Amino acid sequence: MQIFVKTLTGKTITLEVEPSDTIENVKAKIQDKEGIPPDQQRLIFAGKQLEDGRTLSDYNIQKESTLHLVLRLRGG
Numbered sequence: 001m002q003i004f005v006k007t008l009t010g011k012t013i014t015l016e017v018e019p020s021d022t023i024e025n026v027k028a029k030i031q032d033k034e035g036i037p038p039d040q041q042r043l044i045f046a047g048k049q050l051e052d053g054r055t056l057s058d059y060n061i062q063k064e065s066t067l068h069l070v071l072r073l074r075g076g
């Protein structure tokens with residue numbers, strides 16, 4: 001299925017995923033396609049910080065959903 005990732009500078013990245021992909025897999029796909037190391041990625045959806053070990057279906061992320069991507073240089 002198709003999901004979208006929006007950045008703070010207003011750009012949209014499209015990903016091909018399955019509901020059983022983990023957030024870790026998604027960050028790895030962003031890194032594959034955009035070079036951003038997963039540790040610098042924060043994905044946000046529906047008022048939640050998303051956690052690497054859970055699945056898209058765990059957050060009811062469906063076809064056509066749009067995640068927010070925030071980059072960080074350190075922890076928090």
Ligand SMILES: [Mg+2]
Nearest residue numbers: 064065066067
């Ligand atoms: Mg959405």
